[PDB]
Amino acid sequence: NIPSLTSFAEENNYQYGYTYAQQQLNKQRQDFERVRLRPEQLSNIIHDESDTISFRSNLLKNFISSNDAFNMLSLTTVPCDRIEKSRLFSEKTIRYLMQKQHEMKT
Amino acid sequence: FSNKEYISRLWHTLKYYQDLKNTRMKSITSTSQKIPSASIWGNGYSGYGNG
Amino acid sequence: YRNFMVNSYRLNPNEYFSVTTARRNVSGDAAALFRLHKFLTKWGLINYQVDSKLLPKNIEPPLTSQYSTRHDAPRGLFPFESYKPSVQLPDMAKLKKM
Amino acid sequence: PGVLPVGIDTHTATDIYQTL
Amino acid sequence: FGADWYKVAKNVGNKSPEQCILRFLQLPIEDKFLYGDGNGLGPLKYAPHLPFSKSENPVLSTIAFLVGLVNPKTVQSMTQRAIQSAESIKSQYRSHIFATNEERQMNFLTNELIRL
Amino acid sequence: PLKKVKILEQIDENWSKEDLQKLLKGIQEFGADWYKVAKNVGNKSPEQCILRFLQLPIEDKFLYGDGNGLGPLKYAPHLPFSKSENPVLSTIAFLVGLVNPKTVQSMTQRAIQSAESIKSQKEEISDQKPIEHIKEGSEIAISSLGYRSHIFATNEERQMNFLTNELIRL
Amino acid sequence: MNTSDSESTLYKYLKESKRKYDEIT
Amino acid sequence: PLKIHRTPYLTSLKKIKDEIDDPFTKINTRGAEDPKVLINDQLSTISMILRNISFSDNNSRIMSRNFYLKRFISDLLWLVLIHPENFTCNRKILNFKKDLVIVLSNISHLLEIASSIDCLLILILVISFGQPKLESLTFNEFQLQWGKYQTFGVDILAKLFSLEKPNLNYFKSILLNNHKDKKLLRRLLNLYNRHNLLNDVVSFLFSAIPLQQVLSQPSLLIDQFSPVISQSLTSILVIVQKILPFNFNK
Amino acid sequence: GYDINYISKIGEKIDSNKPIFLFAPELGAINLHALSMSLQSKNL
Amino acid sequence: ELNENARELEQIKPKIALQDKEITSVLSNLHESNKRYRFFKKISEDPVKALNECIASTSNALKVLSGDEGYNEDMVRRANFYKENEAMLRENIEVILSNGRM
Amino acid sequence: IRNINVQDALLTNQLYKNH
């Protein structure tokens, strides 16, 4: 097949109305461009991450994540002088930067 | 207005729409058996111009 | 021209109001009258009920019917609500005061 | 919960509004 | 006649039925029994959906009832004055987090080891 | 006309000059621990000490005695004529009992700051309506909530810096 | 809710409420 | 024009996932509560319809002309790239690009490009799929465990280069260099930050040829990716042979 | 104040069985001329 | 030597995978902490407008999850709604009356 | 959606061959 560019012309094709070579080329045209342009009627209809995203699950997760983070704010009756600060380094990041600074003189 | 009434309202709403979907399926299978039944929506056109 | 064509169709809607009678009855060129008649019949309004058919019979399932509505139905839309009266005795005193 | 304050019950605040 | 608008416009006369239906919609019948003119009704403005608890979240419901009364400008002024007073106490680049000289040298050590 | 002197001497209901002195000693010495302030006064609660420090009344009915500026608070249920629970005032006292009272004295001019500044502040808060005390107390409570939210925001920023350093080491 | 009624829930309940408050105070 | 919004694919995905997972989100404010979201949800329905219609053999050659459809495509592609501030959500802006490329993948074998501004916005739209770097090749290779949406662009560029008249003359005058668009094209070309466009298009067309993936692990991946490889090599061969032969400086 | 995991679990079924619009088998004889003239009607 | 380097690659790979697991697990916590930092900062900037956006996007977050829909009941109950929306009502009343459903 | 078939590349090569 792989019919033509002349078979795609408007003269050899039907229009809103109101030969043999044309009716032979339009067989191969409609037999080529209906196995090429047909959509996939099976799975892999996900196509990406941002099509199977769920508004209901994210809305439920945000309803939980706002409620518990607001219960963290108001109901935690620890005064501001008593809120102890967290460490800016870990127990492993403080070992690796003692190791690499020891090995930095090479 | 509490939780035990707000979920019992949702049970007396889902069970309505399940019967509504049963009606919607029966009115589809009626017209697929060449019997002209009415749907949830009205009958669309008549013989006037449009089909 | 438009009022003539629309008034002339609606005297007998079973008849296809042709272009040629409109051309023979008002004075004007055939191109503009043909274009106006085809625009008019494009939007309904004339030749919309030439060959009318009868809808036979509707075997109606329940809830798909006139007067098929209940107070027990859920108001998904129709945003006005019917609210539960709270009969509590301190709230009774509050309602008597307010 | 005892050191926490008490709260206005909204579910009865609406009912004595519509009923009023 | 209950809701037969042709008979209603016939009884009124000199007016289309659409004007009768529109003027029946636009009548202020129940507005003088509702609360407000047009501060705010608060959480009662969101009538059939009230996600607040007396028992679970007692601070948030009282705050929902209280935010209608206050002016936001004075609230912003007082909380920014509290923030600046806390900064004036704490003072007595990201030096607010990296306050110690130890952690600033640790961060500079991190940048040095990254570049090396 | 007598509601004004009623709220003016309902703020100062059962607080003498000596209870005020012990209260101000416990406030200026101790920081954000109102239990030891109440023990420094002795015969009062930490909530009552907070509400006297804010120059507020109690029992929640001398404020909004009717029920128009209070929008939905008229439609709140209650225990009538007995069993006084105070959701507005205990909410305000709970929110102000977390935020380091010296910076609360820095926050508003209304709060008690010293034993020499009680009479002038008591004079300048006079001739106010019962809705004004609700308005000022709710403003102080929401501003303390905003300040606590700022402290939690800075702690979360510190947490994100810690996670960044963990990412870099990994 | 009729306060003029001497046999309603309102009269007995409010009288018992104010009597209980003045009893404890 | 003030700023050509060249946001990539993955940053658009992250912006979508950070807008949905927001507490104060307005992504479901409904239709009857706002007229601007009503216009946007009519336009998204128009684009979903137009990408659904174009999977037929007769519709693909009827939609090819229809001066109305070409003007609508050249009308939306301006708005989604130059002034996307009117679209409410950030998922609608990605979904317009995600079905404009699909509706241009089925048409472009018979499309004659009308204006040069449309021929530039086609290039910017096709470039906007893929990941750049932080001269050299300015496009990191797109590994196809993510999504085949960039493979639709290398067919638009493979079929729109097949006509020596408007399709390749406009592409030549854009890549190498009726009275107001002379001012518009010269404003859009220096808003795109000489010859950054040519090396960006060629480096993106060297992406979506998965050299690293088919040469890491042997016949299945080339049997699956032979058409995208063939059309990408055809497009690069067209650009090399018929565009590159003087105003260069690099 | 609610257990909103169960509420959302039921509301998913409610949104699934809600009559939003017609499905594919119950559209009837789709008339393209009626759609093409209604799109030019400038109604809503 | 090729097979030696291949055995060394297959030895070094699972230690890389166990590190990538923790990289993703720390990235998820970074996004979760970014959400709470934004929620705690927008409140602290303006505590009356953020405390009105926190309520109006919580009841609306319950209306969508429950499945209910429609207008606000307390908005359409007044009379100025049908005076500012005077345009769409004259359309819809004629549409419903002419079709014969009013 | 429609993944890219071999017929698309054949049509492209035919378009370049018949020009």
Residue numbers in the entry:
A (entry chain I): 37 to 54, 67 to 154
B (entry chain C): 368 to 418
C (entry chain E): 346 to 443
D (entry chain A): 481 to 500
E (entry chain D): 542 to 579, 587 to 640, 666 to 689
F (entry chain E): 513 to 579, 587 to 689
G (entry chain D): 444 to 468
H (entry chain B): 876 to 1009, 1021 to 1063, 1078 to 1093, 1102 to 1125, 1129 to 1156, 1183 to 1187
What does the published report state?
SWI/SNF is the prototype chromatin remodeling complex and regulates the expression of 5% genes in yeast. Within SWI/SNF, Snf2 functions as the ATP-dependent motor that drives the fundamental DNA translocation reaction underlying chromatin remodeling, whereas many of the auxiliary subunits target the enzyme to specific loci of the genome. To understand the mechanism of nucleosome recognition, we report the cryo-EM structure of the yeast SWI/SNF complex in complex with the mononucleosome. Based on the specific biological activities involved, the SWI/SNF complex is delineated into three functional modules: the motor module, the actin-related protein (ARP) module, and SRM.
Most of the auxiliary subunits are assembled into the SRM, which is further delineated into two lobes, the DNA-binding lobe (DBL), and the histone-binding lobe (HBL). These auxiliary subunits recognize different features of the DNA and histone components of the nucleosome, and collectively provide the structural basis for chromatin targeting of the complex. DBL of SWI/SNF is composed of multiple elements, including Snf6, the N-termini of Swi1 and Snf5, and Snf12, which directly or indirectly bind to the DNA. The N-termini of Swi1 and Snf5 interact with each other, which may bind to the DNA of nucleosome either through the ARID domain directly, or indirectly through transcription coactivators, providing the structural basis for their cooperation in SWI/SNF targeting. HBL contains two important elements for histone binding, Snf5 and Taf14. A fragment of the C-terminal tail was found, which folded back and sandwiched between Swi3 and Swp82 at the HBL. Intriguingly, at the periphery of the DBL, we identified an IgG-fold domain of Snf12. Because the SWIB domain inserts into the β6–β7 loop, the IgG-fold is barely detectable at the sequence level. Structural comparison indicated that this IgG-fold domain shows a strong analogy to the YEATS domain of TAF14. This YEATS-like domain is ~9 nm away from the exit DNA without any steric hindrance, which would allow binding to transcription factors in a manner similar to the SWIB domain.
